[PDB]
Amino acid sequence: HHHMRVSFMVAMDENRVIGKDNNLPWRLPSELQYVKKTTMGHPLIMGRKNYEAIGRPLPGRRNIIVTRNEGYHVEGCEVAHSVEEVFELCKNEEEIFIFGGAQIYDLFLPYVDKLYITKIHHAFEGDTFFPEMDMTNWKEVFVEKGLTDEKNPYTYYYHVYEKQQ
Ligand SMILES: NC(=O)c1ccc[n+]([C@@H]2O[C@H](COP(=O)([O-])OP(=O)(O)OC[C@H]3O[C@@H](n4cnc5c(N)ncnc54)[C@H](OP(=O)(O)O)[C@@H]3O)[C@@H](O)[C@H]2O)c1
Ligand SMILES: CCc1nc(N)nc(N)c1C#CCc1cc(-c2ccccc2)ccc1OC
Incomplete structure (x- = not known):
């Protein structure tokens, strides 16, 4: 029924860890630059906890916060309370990015x-995980090694998969 491309944007470790103590377990400035480049000019859909950990509206993008709180407001941000409301808000968008967290x-x-x-x-200590995904009828369309240096101290790879069905 929805017409926009629904894309996930996520970084996870060897065990699908995405978060620890309501924050990121790692610091990879180069990875953040890839995120900014890939998502700029497109809506970011964020869980209420993710948004508050980020702490500010991200410029040049529609920031959409997902919450059950019908009295929740943030200046410079839009608030949605269900998947269907997000789809209504984004009905004319080309591509939206689901930006986390796990819920x-x-x-x-x-x-x-x-x-x-x-x-x-790397295997980080963590408490929040990216859900398991059946990749049947998906294909990898992009893969590239991330920059590892003194500022980016882990080995990591960018992957992009597209659903065929
Ligand atoms: N590494 C990564 O790529 C990445 C990306 C994003 C986030 N993270 C990490 O993930 C962690 C946060 O993830 P999380 O799962 O704890 O929180 P989250 O998904 O970001 O937010 C959870 C909140 O979303 C709202 N929500 C959940 N289900 C809903 C529904 N069905 N309808 C309406 N609203 C709903 C609720 O807000 P209300 O309580 O207000 O009702 C809930 O408390 C943090 O540690 C963060 O750093 C990592
Ligand atoms: C940067 C890892 C990350 N990588 C990937 N591939 N997807 C993600 N969804 C996230 C994430 C996240 C959560 C997150 C994002 C930004 C941010 C700041 C400016 C511009 C864009 C994002 C800041 C803090 C933060 O958690 C404290």
């Missing part, structure tokens, strides 16, 4: 068409 990934999992996933080759 919001779970929520939009039945609808994802495209996966931008950074895989970090």
Whole structure:
């Protein structure tokens, strides 16, 4: 029924860890630059917890916060309370990025068409996980090694998968 491309944007470790203590377990400035480049000019759909950890509206993008709180407001941001409300807000958009965290990934999992996933080759301590995904009828359309240096101290790869069905 929806017309926009539903893309996931996520970075996870070897065990699907995405978060620890309501924050990111790693610091990879180069990976963040890839995120900014890939998502700029497109709506970011964020779970309420993710948004508050980010702490500010991200410029040059529609920021959409997902919450059950019908009295929730943030200046410079739009608020949605369900998948269907997000779809109404984004009905004329070309592509939207589901930006996390885990609850919001779970929520939009039945609808994802495209996966931008950074895989970090390290096993972090964590408490929040990217959901398991059946990749049947998906194909990898892009893969590239991320920049590892003194500022980016882990080995990681950018992957993009597209759903065929
Ligand atoms: N590495 C990455 O790529 C990445 C990306 C994003 C986030 N993260 C990490 O992931 C963690 C946060 O993930 P999380 O799962 O704890 O939180 P989250 O998904 O970001 O937010 C959870 C909140 O979303 C709202 N929500 C959940 N289900 C809903 C529904 N069905 N309808 C309407 N609203 C709903 C609720 O807000 P209310 O309580 O206000 O009702 C809930 O408390 C953090 O540690 C963050 O750093 C990592
Ligand atoms: C940067 C890892 C990351 N990588 C990927 N591939 N997907 C993601 N969804 C996230 C994530 C995240 C959550 C997150 C994002 C930004 C941010 C800041 C400016 C511009 C864009 C994003 C800041 C803090 C933050 O958590 C404290």
